[PDB]
Amino acid sequence: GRPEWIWLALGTALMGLGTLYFLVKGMGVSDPDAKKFYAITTLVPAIAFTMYLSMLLGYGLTMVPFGGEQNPIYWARYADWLFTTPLLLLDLALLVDADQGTILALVGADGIMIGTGLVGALTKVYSYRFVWWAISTAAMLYILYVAFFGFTSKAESMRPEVASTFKVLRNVTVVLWSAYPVVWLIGSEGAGIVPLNIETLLFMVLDVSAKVGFGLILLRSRAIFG
Numbered sequence: 190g191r192p193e194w195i196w197l198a199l200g201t202a203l204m205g206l207g208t209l210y211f212l213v214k215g216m217g218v219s220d221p222d223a224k225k226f227y228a229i230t231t232l233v234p235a236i237a238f239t240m241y242l243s244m245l246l247g248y249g250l251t252m253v254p255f256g257g258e259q260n261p262i263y264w265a266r267y268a269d270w271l272f273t274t275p276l277l278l279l280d281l282a283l284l285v286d287a288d289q290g291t292i293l294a295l296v297g298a299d300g301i302m303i304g305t306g307l308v309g310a311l312t313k314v315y316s317y318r319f320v321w322w323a324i325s326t327a328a329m330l331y332i333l334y335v336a337f338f339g340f341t342s343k344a345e346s347m348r349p350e351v352a353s354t355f356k357v358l359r360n361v362t363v364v365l366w367s368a369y370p371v372v373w374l375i376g377s378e379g380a381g382i383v384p385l386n387i388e389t390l391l392f393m394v395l396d397v398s399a400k401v402g403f404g405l406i407l408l409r410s411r412a413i414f415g
């Protein structure tokens with residue numbers, strides 16, 4: 190009965206219901222282009238649902254000694270993010286017809302971001318936790334830079350309605366993704382200022398917005414149709 194369980198339960202509900210709704214809508218669509226966006230976007234909260242559910246049931250949690258104490262760390266978050274973050278970037282790349290080499294570079298950077306974040310989260314020497322955090326944050330900023338400058342440039346060649354939908358999704362992505370390193374820094378994995386229950390609340394609001402919110406915006410747009 191960990192106090193953060195309530196937010197894990199609410200995250201589970203929200204991701205579950207989001208997945209179900211996207212699946213129902215997606216299965217009804219016949220346009221092949223729209224179907225690809227549905228397939229990618231439905232998978233995102235589906236993966237998050239399984240990881241939130243696992244954490245709700247007491248899995249994906251480990252104790253890491255640092256700063257003279259035994260600290261609880263939810264590593265299952267990284268398993269979710271390893272797969273869902275590149276899927277979200279793929280949605281954006283597909284909207285703007287980004288180059289294959291750009292997608293490869295972003296997916297590589299994304300793997301670095303999640304992998305070094307996880308190594309950070311598991312590191313037993315307090316100061317070194319922040320070296321890995323800094324490397325992960327640098328990878329994230331490379332991603333946001335490309336999604337902001339590179340993808341907008343590509344969007345300028347698309348019809349205005351596709352460009353408009355892209356810009357809303359780009360803006361949501363920049364605002365939400367840039368919060369994650371700060372929550373990590375001040376929370377359980379970092380400085381230990383924000384207690385685990387509140388941190389779990391914060392990550393739940395961010396996760397639901399970045400996956401279900403993002404998905405609602407994308408999947409209700411005419412932009413996904415070919």
Ligand SMILES: *C/C=C(C)/C=C/C=C(C)/C=C/C1=C(C)CCCC1(C)C
Pocket residue numbers: 270273274277302303306307322325326329366367369370373396399400
């Ligand atoms: C659905 C989940 C989303 C959109 C998650 C995004 C998560 C990140 C951008 C995480 C970034 C991190 C850093 C920038 C450094 C510290 C650890 C990471 C994983 C939290």
Ligand SMILES: CCCCCCCCCCCCCCCC
Pocket residue numbers: 330331333334337363
């Ligand atoms: C023409 C070139 C150059 C370069 C580059 C710049 C630098 C740096 C950094 C950082 C960050 C971020 C992010 C973005 C976005 C919204």
Ligand SMILES: CCCCCCCCCCCC
Pocket residue numbers: 323
């Ligand atoms: C006393 C010592 C040193 C430390 C640290 C810091 C460097 C912070 C640079 C952050 C780059 C992302």
Ligand SMILES: CCCCCCCCCCCC
Pocket residue numbers: none
């Ligand atoms: C005596 C100490 C030294 C240190 C520090 C630091 C500055 C490193 C800044 C790195 C920025 C990327």
Ligand SMILES: CCCCCCCCCCCC
Pocket residue numbers: 290291294298301324327328331
């Ligand atoms: C598209 C060619 C540019 C490739 C740059 C790859 C980059 C970077 C990464 C990251 C991390 C710390």
Ligand SMILES: CCCCCCCCCC
Pocket residue numbers: 301317320324
């Ligand atoms: C893939 C990036 C690997 C960078 C290694 C840096 C070593 C950190 C010293 C604690």
Ligand SMILES: CCCCCCCCCC
Pocket residue numbers: 320324
């Ligand atoms: C001794 C702590 C400083 C380690 C610096 C690691 C450099 C990271 C390379 C990207």
Ligand SMILES: CCCCCCCC
Pocket residue numbers: none
């Ligand atoms: C806006 C948050 C500031 C409060 C941080 C905390 C603590 C003592």
